[PDB]
Amino acid sequence: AGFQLNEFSSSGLGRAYSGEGAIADDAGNVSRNPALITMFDRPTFSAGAVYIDPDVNISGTSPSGRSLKADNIAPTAWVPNMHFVAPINDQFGWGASITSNYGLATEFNDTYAGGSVGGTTDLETMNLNLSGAYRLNNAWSFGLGFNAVYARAKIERFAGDLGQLVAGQIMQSPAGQTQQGQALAATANGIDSNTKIAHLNGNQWGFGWNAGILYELDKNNRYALTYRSEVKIDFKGNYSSDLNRAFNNYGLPIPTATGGATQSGYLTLNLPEMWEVSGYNRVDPQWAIHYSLAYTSWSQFQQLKATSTSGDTLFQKHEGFKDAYRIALGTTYYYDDNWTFRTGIAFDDSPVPAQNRSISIPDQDRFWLSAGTTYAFNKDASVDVGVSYMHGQSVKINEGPYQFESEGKAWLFGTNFNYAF
Numbered sequence: 502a503g504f505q506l507n508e509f510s511s512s513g514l515g516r517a518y519s520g521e522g523a524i525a526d527d528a529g530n531v532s533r534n535p536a537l538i539t540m541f542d543r544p545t546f547s548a549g550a551v552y553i554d555p556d557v558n559i560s561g562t563s564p565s566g567r568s569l570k571a572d573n574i575a576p577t578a579w580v581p582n583m584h585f586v587a588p589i590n591d592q593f594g595w596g597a598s599i600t601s602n603y604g605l606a607t608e609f610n611d612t613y614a615g616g617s618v619g620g621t622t623d624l625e626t627m628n629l630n631l632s633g634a635y636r637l638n639n640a641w642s643f644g645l646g647f648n649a650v651y652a653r654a655k656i657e658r659f660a661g662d663l664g665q666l667v668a669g670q671i672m673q674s675p676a677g678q679t680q681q682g683q684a685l686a687a688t689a690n691g692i693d694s695n696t697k698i699a700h701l702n703g704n705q706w707g708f709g710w711n712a713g714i715l716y717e718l719d720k721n722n723r724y725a726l727t728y729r730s731e732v733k734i735d736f737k738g739n740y741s742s743d744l745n746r747a748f749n750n751y752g753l754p755i756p757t758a759t760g761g762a763t764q765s766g767y768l769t770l771n772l773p774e775m776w777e778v779s780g781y782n783r784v785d786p787q788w789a790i791h792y793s794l795a796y797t798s799w800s801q802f803q804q805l806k807a808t809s810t811s812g813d814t815l816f817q818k819h820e821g822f823k824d825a826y827r828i829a830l831g832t833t834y835y836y837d838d839n840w841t842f843r844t845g846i847a848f849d850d851s852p853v854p855a856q857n858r859s860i861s862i863p864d865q866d867r868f869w870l871s872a873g874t875t876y877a878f879n880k881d882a883s884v885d886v887g888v889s890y891m892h893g894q895s896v897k898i899n900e901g902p903y904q905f906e907s908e909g910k911a912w913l914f915g916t917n918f919n920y921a922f
């Protein structure tokens with residue numbers, strides 16, 4: 502959903518992803534902890550989807566006087582997940598999984614006065630995870646998996662009112678007192694709002710791996726320590742710019758003008774490392790508790806550079822992050838033989854220094870408020886229903902020459918089905 506926990510299941514979506522990595526009622530946490538494999542005695546799959554309907558709005562006014570307002574820049578999305586877990590011995594067991602990874606969808610109206618720093622920022626990743634696990638004894642379990650990350654990316658930026666803004670930076674400038682000068686302002690005054698200053702898109706695979714350990718006080722109380730590797734996406738796409746090649750080589754903040762000519766861009770993205778610790782304690786045949794303390798290294802993601810075969814910067818964007826923490830407490834109610842009742846809150850800390858808040862990268866991941874319930878038909882198959890209320894912040898921003906006043910929120914609704922063999 503945000504900068505820390507993806508959407509791998511509707512059960513978790515119901516417990517605000519608390520104690521993931523220790524819980525194991527269903528075939529979903531395996532993707533969260535390999536070692537949890539030794540927690541299943543028979544083949545068990547689980548498939549599903551999670552729908553996301555956000556509400557992110559930007560606001561403020563351009564020096565150029567035009568409005569910097571934009572409602573719902575975050576579209577809606579559906580996200581599937583399929584899991585499969587099965588034993589091999591009494592010590593070996595494997596499991597596959599296909600879920601989503603880090604991703605954001607920011608989309609402004611090409612005719613927005615904020616083109617320069619707000620156009621289209623889409624990152625959608627699908628992750629296939631293969632993994633096994635070895636159980637040393639009745640208390641220690643270890644798992645290790647491999648996961649190739651597919652990455653569909655796209656970036657575009659425009660010239661909202663920037664052009665007419667610069668035009669007035671000249672008429673006020675001393676060179677605007679000159680023939681060659683005031684003829685150079687009109688040029689930049691012509692430029693319409695939806696002119697592509699930057700356009701990049703590529704599609705390549707990522708490779709990483711995670712490690713999981715487990716430890717149970719018994720069949721009813723456990724704890725987990727997991728680590729997740731960073732994925733290096735080396736993107737081989739194409740670059741464009743509807744700007745005229747004549748702006749080039751003056752050292753101006755460079756979205757490289759190629760006059761619509763498709764070049765060949767190069768960009769590397771870093772998909773952060775994780776080190777989550779979680780604890781599962783079933784204190785009552787009816788009730789149990791889960792809680793996790795994760796940690797992602799967004800420090801690894803510092804820019805969004807884009808080069809050419811030559812290696813020169815085609816487009817340069819700075820982020821400069823910082824590691825963030827996440828905490829989640831959750832309660833599960835095993836009421837009936839047919840029903841369950843989960844609940845949870847979860848606080849995520851922003852991996853973004855105030856001074857680098859962009860509008861393409863919404864800064865609205867402040868906490869989780871979730872609920873859910875599962876109806877089982879007969880010990881071998883059931884259906885999970887989850888829902889989360891995710892809220893952001895009232896944080897002001899300063900990017901380029903504008904003043905925005907962002908915000909955020911979002912509701913998650915998921916529905917999962919499971920089965921044992």
Ligand SMILES: CCCCCCCCCCCC[N+](C)(C)[O-]
Pocket residue numbers: 503504505603604605622623624654655656701702703736738768770862
């Ligand atoms: C053509 C390449 C486009 C690159 C798109 C990469 C965007 C990386 C943004 C990371 C922001 C964090 N996230 C995933 C949680 O939204």
